[PDB]
Design a protein around this ligand. Sequence first.
Ligand SMILES: Nc1ncnc2c1ncn2[C@@H]1O[C@H](COP(=O)(O)OP(=O)(O)O)[C@@H](O)[C@H]1O
Ligand SMILES: [Mg+2]
Ligand SMILES: [Mg+2]
Length: 960
Amino acid sequence: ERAAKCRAYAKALHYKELEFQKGPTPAILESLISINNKLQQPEAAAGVLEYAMKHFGELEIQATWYEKLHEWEDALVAYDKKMDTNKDDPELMLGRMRCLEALGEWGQLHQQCCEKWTLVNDETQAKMARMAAAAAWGLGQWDSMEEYTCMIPRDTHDGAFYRAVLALHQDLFSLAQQCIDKARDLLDAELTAMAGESYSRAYGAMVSCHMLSELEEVIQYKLVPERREIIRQIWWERLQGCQRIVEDWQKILMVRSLVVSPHEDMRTWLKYASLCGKSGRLALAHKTLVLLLGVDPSRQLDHPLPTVHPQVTYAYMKNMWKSARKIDAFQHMQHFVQTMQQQAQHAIATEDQQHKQELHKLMARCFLKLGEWQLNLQGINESTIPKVLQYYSAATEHDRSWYKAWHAWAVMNFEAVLHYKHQNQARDEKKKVTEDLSKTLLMYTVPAVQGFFRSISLSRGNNLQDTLRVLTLWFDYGHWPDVNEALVEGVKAIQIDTWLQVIPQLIARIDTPRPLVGRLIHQLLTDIGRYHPQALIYPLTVASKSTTTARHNAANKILKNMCEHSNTLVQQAMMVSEELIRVATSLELQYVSPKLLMCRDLELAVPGTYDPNQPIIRIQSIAPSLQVITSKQRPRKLTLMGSNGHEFVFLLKGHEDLRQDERVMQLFGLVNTLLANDPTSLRKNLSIQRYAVIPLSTNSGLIGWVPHCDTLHALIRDYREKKKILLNIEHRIMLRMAPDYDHLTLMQKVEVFEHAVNNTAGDDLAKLLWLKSPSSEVWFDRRTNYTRSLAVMSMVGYILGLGDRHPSNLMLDRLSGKILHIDFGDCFEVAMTREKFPEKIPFRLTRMLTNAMEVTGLDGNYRITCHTVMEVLREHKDSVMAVLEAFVYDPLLNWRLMDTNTALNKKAIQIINRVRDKLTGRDFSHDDTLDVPTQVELLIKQATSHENLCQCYIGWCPFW
Ligand SMILES: Nc1ncnc2c1ncn2[C@@H]1O[C@H](COP(=O)(O)OP(=O)(O)O)[C@@H](O)[C@H]1O
Ligand SMILES: [Mg+2]
Ligand SMILES: [Mg+2]
């Protein structure tokens, strides 16, 4: 019955949205935020309010708008302006207060309550009490609470609750016991009264039911003394676990405040204060901290800080940094660290070793901020370089383990190198020059290498960035002994696994002209041969049949070496990739390649299915028939049978260098991990459907066939033919109007373009996805999926510079809805830079895409998902840049940038800057460093502009 209630909603939402289509009315708009709420789609509904604002300033008072937008801090200052310019107005005061109770502003909420007590209104008098109870509860003042509670009806969930709290202070446990169960039922029955159309009160019912069950443990915490540890554990664990915006946690802790004071909680409140900063309530976090210190909001500003609680101070100081005062913050840190080593070296009389180590760990985490801040305030130059390296090395000492510490040191060292390499390129633009540079670079290079290595070993699983960074220093440094020793030392130390991530990069340099570099690679690859042969054969096989002599030569030496322990695997894989190149409306295997029909029960793993952790699935049998996909390149629909039993379908492409597609699928892999690790992105299932890419030569290669998918172009062509609509009708429309369309001025083009849109249906996609759906909660979910997955690939695609996104280059999963990108030819601006028909667009946000989303589309799920995704990216911009750098400066893959014709070092540099700009918000204006939502808005604007879409090559179907 539960999953049966949402179906009626989903269906009515469809007609409700189809109604909005016919005419946007505040009547519908109301019934829309409601139904999107019962359907527990908070953001899609938030979108409906965004539209409600930008079209109807009619529910009026910009303070009521900020209040509905849960921007309480904005609505408060808007209500002051609305009260100081107006009068008393009983309504304006209620809001002025609701802001205060949301903000945890008990001081002002209690003052505003008492100092204004004429309140001739009885409803004003009734609401008043609910709030002034919580305000009094926060301020301690329990006499004020019971006064205001004795005004709250015992018929309300609120009235029944506040008694349970007053009983718990006055130690009336049986009273408190019953009041909870009665408040539960007054809330349970209230969740049926407004059964659907409520605020974040359905999600705040969780906040009240959470607190009530917590208040039943605060009950457990009064007479019979056994569970103090058990209760504090569940309190602590279901807090790191729990995730609820500031406001709720205030109240949640206020329940825990009835028993455990902040001074005993300590870690509990610091974790809370930590969130208040990270969310953006510094004024609140400060007060939390001032309380824990038992010392001033440092009103004595010139004075040093209290060392009494080392952790609290560190918190205060990092809050001070994220706050305004940050030369002041830095300063307090230099001194704090100095006070801390003294309080260690001296105060530690052996019998204190736990305190010693935690004091040493806090210090490390202090130094890492010190170096972080020094770089922030000063940048990288001859003065700060040895200072921060000082701070980091010092952090490396006090924690020994800890990824960040070693990582930071490595990067700083690696950027010490870059600083001078780039400073000497500056000099040579206008003998003892190279000698000092040699000593300069060898100075920072070696420790960087060392750092990256001990950083990697502390990262197992997630170390792609650092692993790649090792390879930059490695490959890039035509080897002077010192560097090579550290590299050899690391390779010995670090696990073999590490290197699997990085195999295509290693292979891209088998034929390294530098003598000392080559040797290690070859040796490393051969060890990666002894264990994990499989992750090597396919790529090594390809390399071994290379026109470039030194490649295939060196490639063979390793294959030879691998026969000494895995011969037939090399042998099988040798032949299987040989026959597949030969093969590259149907083809029977018995005519085309008999050796393949011959194959049974091989030990060769099904292309791109090998990974440790997972039982090897091997090619058991190759299906005798391959469909020939009719195209200009006639790809094949090869299909293999697995040693598990499952089938594995592939696309054998003939004249397409699949190596680029590979590094992209790699980049996507990374991006997927990043989104799986940001809480919100994981909360919303944000991902990119990827697929397997197994290059077979420079000509050919295999591609994983994503099941259940049709090109955007397919779904339309079917719908159009079903509904008797001419496939290219917008097209025929344009030419009938303007036979020379392609030659018109921008102004002239826009008209013709607009004409076509105004005389064709923009639903199609939207509409066929409705008919496709077997139900409507399936329909709704498939939409929610589609919307997100697309915004994901919009942002990522932009950073990649992913051009050429026409209706045959993206497709839709007909079972999840999630969108999927294929054909990664045009990467980086490339498509925009071209001579004939330059793409102005950043990513495809065509009309029928916009239209398949919820109405209120771009405001709702899409845009929100856009900054969430873009957010992640800008944070982890270094990892993203490691990958991208790793195939822009890649030797074999530079051929897709000298195509600006139809040395390269200079071009490659730009391409990479261009990406950094995109990840530091300098992608538009040179000088402004635009924040996420702005940049996102700017981009959505750019993707939507008729002036941009009309200029698109007609194939791109800028009207689909
Ligand atoms: N990974 C994939 N999964 C499913 N189908 C695919 C995949 N890659 C390509 N196709 C199909 O092959 C067709 C033509 O190949 P495509 O990749 O578009 O090459 P090109 O860009 O050279 O035409 C596509 O329109 C699509 O139907
Ligand atoms: Mg294509
Ligand atoms: Mg292409």
